[PDB]
Design a protein around this ligand. Structure first.
Ligand SMILES: Nc1ccn([C@@H]2O[C@H](COP(=O)(O)OP(=O)(O)O)[C@@H](O)[C@H]2O)c(=O)n1
Ligand SMILES: [Mn+2]
Ligand SMILES: [Mn+2]
Length: 269
């Protein structure tokens, strides 16, 4: 079976309980994870250890908090106490875990299921070939020996409009924001980097990225996490918002792809 779970945010106990609920069995089943494995919840260390151990039985995409952890580890960014990353950063296997983490994709595609996953979704300004090329470029920088230079370069809110003519720092910044921070779009598809509330309580003319017709969403189902204030609600057919805010006292959601059956684990907090 194929299971897809939204942002775990260090909620190891809930993750394992949800996987036991569905009798998740590596070798017979595959797990897709929307990223943001770490931060806020208490068990980022255990989460990364487990997910790395799954190997080919897990398909991960990196989220914005995974990238932030990598930046903290590399000495690029400051550790925020509320993220609760210190046990992971101080672990004897921190190098192994984080060097594995930075090698993981930004984008997962399964052609037989016509299914795409990224942390925040797929901007309507991208077709599939462009999304793939952009994921490859940023994955290449993250898996290289020079990844701390990219992590430093990644921070920024501009440019927020895609063009194939974008080059250099702006190109990588837009790519990173589209895959890991996107929520609202302007009517022309341009990213808004500030509003993080639910679609109903957002100011006009902002609309969810998935409310703007785009070439990937026309052909593929898209699963994503990231947007906790969405509460997994209000998406169009073929769009699966899996982040139901476990670390926030919400729930951890798992979708089984074959029958579109949902399973939910209450937050322990
Ligand atoms: N149900 C919720 C959950 C979070 N939030 C807020 O949304 C902001 C972004 O958090 P998020 O969980 O959606 O995304 P990430 O920061 O994990 O990437 C936080 O500052 C939360 O306070 C909200 O307004 N409503
Ligand atoms: Mn998140
Ligand atoms: Mn996120």
């Amino acid at each position: 079976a194929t299971y897809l779970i939204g942002d775990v945010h260090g909620c190891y106990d809930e993750l394992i309980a949800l996987l036991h609920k569905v009798e998740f069995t590596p070798g017979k089943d595959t797990l897709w994870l929307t990223g943001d494995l770490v931060a806020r919840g208490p068990g980022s260390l255990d989460v990364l250890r487990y997910v790395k151990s799954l190997g080919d039985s897990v398909r991960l995409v990196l989220g914005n908090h995974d990238l932030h952890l990598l930046a903290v580890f590399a000495g690029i960014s400051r550790n925020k106490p509320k993220d609760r990353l210190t046990p992971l950063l101080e672990a004897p296997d921190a190098d192994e875990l984080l060097n594995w983490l930075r090698r993981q994709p930004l984008l997962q595609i399964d052609e037989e299921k016509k299914l795409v996953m990224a942390h925040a979704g797929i901007t309507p300004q991208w077709d599939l070939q462009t999304a793939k090329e952009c994921a490859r470029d940023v994955e290449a920088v993250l898996s290289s020996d020079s990844y701390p230079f990219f992590l430093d370069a990644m921070y920024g809110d501009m440019p927020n409009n895609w063009s194939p003519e974008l080059r250099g720092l702006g190109r990588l910044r837009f790519i990173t924001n589209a895959f890991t921070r996107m929520r609202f779009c302007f009517p022309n598809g341009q990213l808004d980097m500030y509003s993080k509330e639910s679609p109903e309580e957002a100011p006009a003319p902002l609309k969810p990225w998935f409310a703007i017709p785009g070439p990937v969403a026309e052909e593929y189902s898209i699963a994503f996490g990231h947007w906790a204030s969405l509460e997994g609600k209000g998406t169009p057919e073929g769009i699966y918002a899996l982040d139901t805010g476990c670390c926030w006292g919400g729930t951890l959601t798992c979708l089984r792809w074959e029958d579109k059956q949902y399973f939910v684990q209450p937050s322990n907090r």
